Amino acid sequence: NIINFDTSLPTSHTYLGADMEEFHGRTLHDDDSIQVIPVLPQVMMILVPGQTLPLQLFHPQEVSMVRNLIQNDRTFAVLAYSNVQEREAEFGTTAEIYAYREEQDFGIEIVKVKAIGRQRFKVLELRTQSDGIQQAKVQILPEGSGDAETLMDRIKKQLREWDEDSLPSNPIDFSYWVAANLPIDDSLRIQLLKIDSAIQRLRCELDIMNKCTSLCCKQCQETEITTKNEIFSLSREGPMAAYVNPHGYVHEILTVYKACNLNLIGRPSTEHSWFPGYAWTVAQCKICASHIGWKFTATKKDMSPQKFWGLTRSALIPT
Ligand SMILES: O=C1C[C@]2(CCN(S(=O)(=O)NC3CCN(CCNC(=O)c4cccc(-c5cn6cc(C(=O)NC7CCC7)ccc6n5)c4)CC3)C2)C(=O)N1
Ligand SMILES: [Zn+2]
Secondary structure, three states: OOOEOOOOOHHHOOOOOOOOEEOOOOOOOOOOOEEEEEEOOOOOOOOOOOOEEEEEEOOHHHHHHHHHHHOOOOEEEEEOOOEOOOOEOOEEEEEEEEEEEEEOOOOOOEEEEEEEEEEEEEEEEEEEOOOOOEEEEEEEOOOEOOOOHHHHHHHHHHHHHHOOOOOOOOHHHHHHHHHHHOOOOHHHHHHHHHOOEHHHHHHHHHHHHOOOOEEEEOOOOOOEEEEOOOEOOOOOOOOEEEEEOOOOOEEEEEEEOOOOOEEEEEEEEOOOOOOOOEEEEEEEEOOOOOEEEEEEEEOOOOOEOOEEEEEEHHHEEEO
16 A cells, blocks of 8 residues: 555566667558558457557567568557457557567577557458468558546546556547556457547446456456455556566566465566566466466565565456
8 A cells, every 4th residue: 555666667677678779750550541560470469559568579580570670660560369269350459669679698589679559450451471470451440539528537536446646638548548457358358449439438448347346267267366446556557567478478467466365386586577676476376276477575675565466367357
């Protein structure tokens, strides 16, 4: 309930690298325009405009694609797969690289990037080259706003009950902040993205956060892991942010203060820690033993909070 922590520290993704080449030029595709944007193969998430996405690529094809993209408009396509295994996606969001680093070592050539969601699109064609790089023929969607600040002042009211402003004031920007930080599942995330007007998004987004109770283990159905009132915001991105592990896997985690039915595996560690100053420990379900997230404990008595949890969306479902 008290915070001694640079909340703007997790957004920097210091674990990735000390200093990376920043990029300031901004590409924004005109409304209803048809573009050919390449797709990163391993990324399997629902990206929201403004959501930051970190990446660590080791395959020579991914390195060759992003090395090429850096010299151009630095924009790749993140599809919102309707079925993950079937590669079936009809919508998606563009991602613009704003940070980049070329590290060798480990015998391989690596590229670490930090992208951010820009604009949604409707997929027209999804064609794969002979090498393997997937290219997407997409149609940029238009961004409608509207006059309904009462809806924003109602979202902000229930948001502050679960955690104690500094939120976006733009009705459009705030509509996507809510879409990226609410503990909703993928199917609901797509419904928010398919919505065109911010008024519909904000009016809809009000409808779910009243029907959202608690989060339970996916493999277990009825194992209450945390409630909608334990949400803690330790980052400027909010209570929901994406972080990449040493292997390159992106985890969309949620920061909560109290969690139940969780077993910690081993002793705390500070290696590659996503929250500088804290140590991590693998948290597992008590019954089914499926990985739920990580327990973060402070390494100093001067900082606060002393403990919190970061659980991934892929292991939890609302109930
Ligand atoms: O603050 C933060 C938070 C964290 C801290 C670190 N994480 S974590 O995501 O890395 N680890 C978590 C914990 C492990 N997983 C749950 C349990 N295991 C499983 O279910 C499971 C099932 C089947 C296969 C495997 C598996 C593990 N293997 C490791 C290697 C490898 O090369 N090992 C060497 C290099 C290190 C020695 C190779 C093959 C491989 N197969 C595992 C979930 C991921 C995030 C961070 O990075 N920063
Ligand atoms: Zn379980």
